[PDB]
Paper text:
Telacebec inhibits the mycobacterial respiratory supercomplex composed of complexes III and IV ([name]). Each [name] contains two sites where redox reactions with MQ occur: a QP site near the positive (periplasmic) side of the membrane where MQH2 is oxidized and a QN site near the negative (cytoplasmic) side of the membrane where MQ is reduced.
We then incubated [name] with both DMWH2 and telacebec to produce an inhibited complex and determined the structure of this complex to a nominal resolution of 3.0 Å by cryoEM. Telacebec binding did not cause large-scale conformational changes in [name] but produced a clear density for the inhibitor in each of the two QP sites in the CIII2 dimer. The inhibitor’s imidazopyridine moiety, amide linker region, and A-phenyl and B-piperidinyl moieties are all resolved clearly, with weaker density toward the end of the tail, which points into the lipid bilayer toward the cytoplasmic side of the membrane (pale blue surface). These densities show that telacebec binds with its head group deep within the QP binding pocket in a pose similar to UQ and the UQ-analogue inhibitors bound within the canonical CIII2. Although hydrogen bonds cannot be detected with complete confidence at the present resolution, the position of the N1 nitrogen in telacebec’s imidazopyridine moiety is consistent with formation of a hydrogen bond with the His368 from the QcrA subunit, which also binds the FeS group (dashed teal line). The 2-ethyl group from the imidazopyridine is ~4 Å away from Ile178 from the QcrB subunit, providing hydrophobic interactions (dashed green line), while the 6-chloro group from the imidazopyridine is close to the backbone carboxyl group of Leu166 from the QcrB subunit, enabling formation of a possible halogen bond (dashed purple line). Thr308, which is homologous with M. tuberculosis Thr313 and is known to be important for binding, is <4 Å away from the linker region of telacebec. Although the rotameric state of Thr308 is ambiguous at the current resolution, one of the rotamer states could form a stabilizing hydrogen bond with the carbonyl group of the linker region (dashed teal line).
Residue numbers in the entry:
A (entry chain P): 1 to 13, 22 to 50
B (entry chain Q): 27 to 338
C (entry chain R): 10 to 561
D (entry chain U): 1 to 79
E (entry chain V): 13 to 157
F (entry chain S): 1 to 203
G (entry chain T): 1 to 139
Write the structure that this text describes.
Amino acid sequence: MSSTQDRSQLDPEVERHTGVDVEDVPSAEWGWSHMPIGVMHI
Amino acid sequence: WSDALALGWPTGITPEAKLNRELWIGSVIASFAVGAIVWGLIFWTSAFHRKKATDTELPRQFGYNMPLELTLTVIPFLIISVLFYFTVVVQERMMHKDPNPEVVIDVTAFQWNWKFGYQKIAFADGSFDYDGADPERKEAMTSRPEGKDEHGIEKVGPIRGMTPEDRTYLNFDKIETLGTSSEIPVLVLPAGKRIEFVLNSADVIHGFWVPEFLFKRDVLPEPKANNSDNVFQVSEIQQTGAFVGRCTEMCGTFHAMMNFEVRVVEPNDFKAYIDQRNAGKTNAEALAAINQPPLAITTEPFESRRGELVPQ
Amino acid sequence: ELEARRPFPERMGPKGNLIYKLITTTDHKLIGIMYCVVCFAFFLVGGLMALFMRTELAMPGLQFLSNEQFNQLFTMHGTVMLLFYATPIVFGFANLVLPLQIGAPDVAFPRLNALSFWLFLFGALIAIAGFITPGGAADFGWTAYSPLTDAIHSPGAGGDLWIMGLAVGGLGTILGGVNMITTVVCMRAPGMTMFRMPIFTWNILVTSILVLIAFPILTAALFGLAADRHLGAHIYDPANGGVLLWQHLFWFFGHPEVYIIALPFFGIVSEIFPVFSRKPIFGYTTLIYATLAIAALSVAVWAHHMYATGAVLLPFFSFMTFLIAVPTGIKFFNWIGTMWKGQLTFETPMLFSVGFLITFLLGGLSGVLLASPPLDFHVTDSYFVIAHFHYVLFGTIVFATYAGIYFWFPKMTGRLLDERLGKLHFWLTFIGFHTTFLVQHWLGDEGMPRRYADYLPTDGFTTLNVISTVGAFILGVSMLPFVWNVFKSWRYGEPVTVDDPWGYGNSLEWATSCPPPRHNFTELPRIRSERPAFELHYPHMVERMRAEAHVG
Amino acid sequence: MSTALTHGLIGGVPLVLFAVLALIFLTRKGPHPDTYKMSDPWTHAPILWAAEEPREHGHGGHGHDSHGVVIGGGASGKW
Amino acid sequence: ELDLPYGSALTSSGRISAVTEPGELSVHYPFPTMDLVVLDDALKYGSRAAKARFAVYIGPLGADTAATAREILANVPTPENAVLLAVSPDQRAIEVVYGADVKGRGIESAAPLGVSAAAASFKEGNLIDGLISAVRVMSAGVSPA
Amino acid sequence: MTSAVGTSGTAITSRVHSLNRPNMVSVGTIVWLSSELMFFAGLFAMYFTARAQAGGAWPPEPTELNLALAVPVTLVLIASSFTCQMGVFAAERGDVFGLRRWYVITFLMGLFFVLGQGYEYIHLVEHGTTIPGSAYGSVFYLATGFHGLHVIGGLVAFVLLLARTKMSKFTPAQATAAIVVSYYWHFVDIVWIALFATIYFVR
Amino acid sequence: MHIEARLFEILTAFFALAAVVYAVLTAMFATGGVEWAGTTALVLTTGLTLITGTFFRFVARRLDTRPEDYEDAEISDGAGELGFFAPHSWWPILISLSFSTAAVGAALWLPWLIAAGVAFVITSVCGLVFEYYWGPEKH
Ligand code: HEA
Ligand code: HEA
Ligand SMILES: CCCCCCCC/C=C\CCCCCCCC(=O)OC[C@H](COP(=O)(O)OCCN)OC(=O)CCCCCCCCCCCCCCC
Ligand SMILES: [Cu+2]
C-alpha cells in the first residue's frame, strides 16, 4: 500500500519499429535492447 | 569345473588358503543358486506382459502377502546364519597364533617398496640357532631439559613423551631382503613350514598381498598403537617356486611399483640360502648359490620412467 | 465445444526467463531440475575420468597417464561420482517430487534448499579445482586414508581443496537433509497420514536421517584432517590411534553414505514398479519397515570395509553386515512381487527399473560374498570390490536415476522423452556396463588390486582389461543417446497435456497438471490410501483396491 | 598385446554396437500419428489452433465477458 | 456429462485430471512435430506484427461453411481482433473470418491472398504448408493496430 | 491496493500456526542441532581415541589443566543458558523488550565465556601445550575451539536476532526465531557441559 | 504427530542397543579394549535420534491430532493460511559463494582469504535473515 504508481514521460528517438519487440524484451522502448545478430556472429 | 566356478582363484598354497578357497566356492554356489532363482523369477514375471487380448481388466491388485513375506524374510536369515557360521569357523583358521612359529619373517613395507628381515628361524626338527639383532631400534624421546621457554616447561614429547618420528615399532633384523626400485625383492621361505609374518610400515599405511596365499593384511604404520594385529601366521606352504605379491592398499603415487616376490624353497635350500646370506652376499647371490634365479621371475622392477611417451 | 490450443507448445521460452530465476529461484521444482542437470554434468565429468583410467588400464604400460595422474583420476572420479553426483541427485529427486508426493506446496525452508544446492555446486567446483593446480587433484583414493592424507604424504594443495570442497558439499547435504525431514514431518496433505505417503518419500526421510547421522562425522573428520595438514595437529598421528581413528570415522560416514546413495533410488524404483505393473507396491508396510531396518543397521556396520586392517571386531561387523543384507532381500522380493501378475508394459522407465533389479542382484551377491572376512581378505581392496560396488552403484543410482528421469521428466517438463531413444540408451548402457564390470570380478580375484595405474605384461589380466575398456567405451557411447534425447525432448518432443503420461500412476504427483503448477497443486484428491492418483483416475477400482489387498 | 588391434577394438566395438542398436530401435515406427494424407478423409477430431500472441490485458477469466464475435468480414475457397 | 472413456476423473475444482496409457501420446495431431512447430511459429511470432490473434481450424466445417466459420471464430479467445482460417479437407472448403477490431488494417485485401495461398498449397498436396503460407500471407497483410 | 490481498499484519508470519501444528523453524533447528551433535561426536571420538593411546598420564607433563579459569566459564555458560530461557519466556509473550534484555545479557555472558576460553588458551600455550606440540594439546584445542566457534556463531545469531527485532514489529515469527536461537544456545551449553566433564573432570 | 516421534524412538532404541553391545563386545574380546571411535559415534548418533525423537514426542503430546495425522481427513479440513514460505531470494547463492571463499581460504592456507570469507558469510547471512524484515527506508 505504501507506494504510488509512477508516470514516466521520456523522450523517444531508429523508431524501434524494426529489430526487437516488447514481447521478447519487455523494456524495448526504454533503451537499447537489440544488438544485430550479424555483429554478434562476426 | 571348480577352477571355472572359482571365479579366478589363485590356487591355494597354504592350508588356510585352501580352506578359504573352499569357503569361497561354497558361498559362490549359494549365491549363484540365489541369483539364478531370482533371475528366473524376474524373467518369468517379465513374461507377464500386457497381452493385447486382455480387455479392461486390471490385475488382482493383491499386495500384502503376509505368509509369503514371512517365509522370504525368515529363510534369508537361515542362509545368512549358515554362511556366517561357515565364515566364523573358517576365520578361526586365519591366525592360529602358534607361540612357536617355524620361521619368522619381519615384513617391513616402506613407502613404495618392501624389506624382509628374517626375524627368527627355529625348526622343530632341530636346527637354525638364529635370531634377529635388534640393536637398531632407537627412539626419539625429546625429553630436553628446557624448551623455547626459559624454565618450567621441560617438555617431554608430543605423544606418550615421544616424537611421532620415533621408529620404536619398526624392528630391524640381520638378514634384510631389501628391494630397490630396480630389483624386485624376493622373499625366500621354506616349503612345509609355519611362517610368521610380523608386519610393519615405515612411512604410510598399505597392504601386503600374496594372491596365492588367498590372504592379505594392511601393514599399518604403528599397529600396536592402532589396536591392530600386525602378526599373521601361515600354517604351511606346500607348493614351491615363486609367487607374486602386491601392495594391496593405497601406498602413494608409486602404489603399483611395490610388487614383491616370495620364493618358497625346500628346507635344505632355505638352510643354504640363510647360510650364504649370513656371509656377506646379496639376495641375488644367495639365490644363485642355491641354483635358483636371482631376480623375481613372476615380476620385474618395471621401468621407473614416468611412461612410454617420456623422451627417455 | 472445442478449445483454442496451440499447434505445439513453447519450445524454449521467451528470452531471459531463466537466468534470474536460477540465481533467485526458491521453488523446489526448478531447484530439483538444476540438481538433476548439474549432477548429470558431474556424472559426465566423473565418467570422463573413468574412461581416462580405463584407456590407461587397457595396456600394461603407462601409455599416457603418469602414476600420480592416474591416481588423481581414480580419486576424483570416485569422489565426483559418490559425493558430487549421487548424494546430490538424491536430493535433486527429493526437491523434484517429494513436495508433490506429500501434497505440499513447497519445501519447508525453500531458501535453505536453494542454499543447499548452491553450497553443493560451489563445493563441487572447488573440489574439482584441484586439477587446475600444478600438483593436481588429490592423489589419495576416495577413502583418503590417514597417513597418506597428512601434509607429509600428499602435501599438495589439491588435497586441501578436496578436503574443503567435500566439507562444503557436506554442509549443503546436511542442510538438504534437515529441509527434507522438516518438509515430510510438517508439510503434508490434510489426508496424507504418515503410513499412506509414497515409498519414495519414506526412503527420502530415512535417507535424510542417515544424512544427518553420517555427514556431520565427515565434516568433523575433514576438519580434523585440515587441522592436521595446516597446523600439524597430531589428530591422526599413526603413533596415536590415528590411522584407525580415521578409518573408523570415515567409514562410519561413508557406509551410511552408500546407503543414503541407495535408499532414495530404491524408493524411485518402488514408485516405478507399481505404475507399469498396474498393481500396488507389494508389501508397502514391508518396504517401509525394510527401509527403517536398512538405515538402522547401516548406521552400525560401518567397519566391514576394515576387515584387512586387523584392527576391528570382525564377528560383530560381519553379523551386522548379514543382518543388513537381509532387509535388502526383503525389499528385492517386494519389488518382484509388485511386478508379479500384472499387465506389465516395458517402457523405458521400467526397462531401467528391471535393469536395476538385474544388476543390483549380482551386486548384492558380490556383497554377501564380501561380507565374510575370510573371503574379503583375498578379495579386499581388489577389482572384485570394484565390481561389487560398481554393480550395486551403477544399478542403484544410474539405472534407477535413469528410470526416475524417464519417469518424472514429463511431470517436470510437460514433454515425453522419445521412447525409441530410451530403448537404445538403456540397451547400450546395460550391455556396456555388464561388459565393463563383469570381467572385473575375475580380474580382482586373480591378483590385481584396485588403484593400479599399470601392470606387467608378464602378469595376466590384459585381455580382460581391454574387455573392460570395450565396455567402458560402450557406456561412453551409451551416454550420447540419453543426452540427445533429453536435449531434443525438453523443448521439442511429444507434448503431454494430462496427468499420468505413464497411465495407472500413483503417489499423488500425478494429481496435478503435468507441468506442475507453482505450489504444485490446484486440487488435491481424497487421500485414502497409498495411491491417491490411482484412486482419483480410476474410482471404480477403489473397492477392488481394498478387496484384493489382503489376499496377497 | 597388438596395441593397434586392441585400440581398434575398443574404438570400434562400442561404435559398431551403437550402430547396430540404432538400426534396431531408431528404425522403428514411433508413437506419433502418421501425417494426414490429403486424399484420405479427415479422421481426426476438429482442431482449433490459436496464437496466444496478443496480450489479454487481465489474466483472470472473470471480467472478460462475451461482448460479441462482431464478425468483420469473410472469404472462401475450394482448393 | 461423461469424462474421457477411461482414466479421466473430474477433480474438486473445474479442472479435469486425465491420463493416458504408458505407450500412446496425448496431442495425437496427425502432422510431423516439425511442421506443427513451424505453424506455431507462423501463428505466434509470424503474427506479432499483425497484433491480431491468428487461428487455424483444420476440422470439418459443414453446412454453410461461412456461418460455422463464424461460430468457430466465436471459440477464439479474442474473436474481435482475430483472423481464423478454417479449412475442411473433406469438403475441400476454405473460409476466413475476422472481427470488428481487424478492419481497415489490410485484412480484407489479404483475405483472398491467404485463401489463394492455402488453396494452391492444398491442390499441390500439403495441408500444413498451405496453413503456414496462408497464416504468413495474412499476417504480413495485417498492419499492427 | 484497497486494504490488502493477504490479510496479514506483517510481511512475514510464522511458518506454521504453532497452536495446533508443529513450528517448522523449531523442528528444523532441532534436527540440525541433532546433526551438529554428531559433528561434536566426531570431535569427541578423536579426543577419546587419543586418550586411550597415552601412557597412563593423559594430560602430558607440560600441560596442566586450570580449573580456576575452567569452572567459572562453564558456570557462566550455564547462567547464559538460564538467561536465554528467560529471554524465551519473554519472547512467547509480546514483550520484545524483555526478550532483548535477556538475550543481551546472555550475549554478554557468552562473550565473557569466549574471552575466558581465549585467556585459558593463552595460558595453556604459554605453558607449553600447543596444537603442533602434542596429541593431547591438539585434540583438546580442536574440541574446545570448535565448541568456541559454535559459541561465536551463537553470539552472531544473538546479535542478528536482536537487530531483526529492532528492524520490524515483534511478531510470532520473530518469537519463533528467538526460540530456535535459544535451542541452539542450549545445545551449545549442553555440549560444553559434556566437553568440560570429559576434558576436566573425567580426564 | 505420534508416528514421527515413534520412528525416532525406534531408531533411538536400536542405536542405544548397538552402542551398548559394541562397547561390551569391544571392551572385552578386542586387542585394545573399547575402540572409542565407533563406540562414541554410536553413542552420539543415539543422542542425535534421542534429541529429535524427544522433541517430536513432546510436540505430539502437546499437539492435537492434525489432519496430516488423521485418517479419513477431508482436504478441506487442512484448508487455511499456511505459513510464510520465503519467495525468490538471491541471498542463498551469495551465502554459498561467501562460504566457498572461506573454504578456499581454509584449503589454501590464506588467513586473509579466510577472514574475508568469514566477513562475507556474516554479511550474506545477515542479508538472508533480514531479507523479510528490513523495514522501508525512512530517508
Ligand atoms: C549404492 C552403493 C552401495 C550399496 C547399496 C552397497 C551395498 C552393500 N555393500 Fe557395499 N560398497 C559400496 C557401495 C555400496 N554397497 C562402495 C562404494 C564400497 C567401496 C569400498 C572402498 O572402495 O573402500 C563398498 C564396499 C563394500 C565392502 C568392502 C569390500 C572391501 O573393500 O574389501 C563390503 C563387504 O565387505 C560391502 C558389502 C555390502 C553389502 C553386504 C551390501 C548390501 O546392503 C546389498 C547387497 C546384498 C544383498 C544381500 C542384496 C541381495 C539380497 C537378496 C538377493 C535376498 C536373498 C539373498 C540372500 C539372503 C543372500 N560393500
Ligand atoms: C557413482 C559412482 C560410480 C560410477 C557411475 C562409476 C562408473 C565407472 N567406473 Fe568407477 N569407481 C567408483 C564409483 C563409480 N564408478 C568408486 C567410488 C571407485 C573407487 C575410487 C577409489 O578407490 O578411490 C571407482 C573406481 C573405479 C576404478 C578403479 C581405478 C583404480 O583404482 O585403478 C575403475 C577402473 O576402470 C572404474 C571404472 C569405472 C567405469 C569404466 C565406469 C562407467 O560406468 C562410467 C561411465 C562413463 C561415462 C558415461 C562417461 C562418458 C561421457 C563422455 C565421453 C562425455 C564427457 C563430456 C564432458 C565431461 C563435458 N571405477
Ligand atoms: C577450517 C579451518 C582450518 C582447518 C581446521 C582448524 C580447526 C581449529 C579450530 C579451533 C582452534 C582455534 C583455537 C586457536 C588457539 C589455540 C592455541 C594453539 O593452537 O597454539 C598456538 C598455535 C601456534 O603453536 P606453535 O607454532 O607451536 O608456537 C607455540 C608458541 N610458543 O597457533 C595455531 O596454530 C592455532 C591457529 C588455528 C586458527 C584456526 C582458525 C579457524 C577459523 C576458520 C574459519 C572457518 C573456515 C571455513 C572452512 C570451510
Ligand atoms: Cu606401500
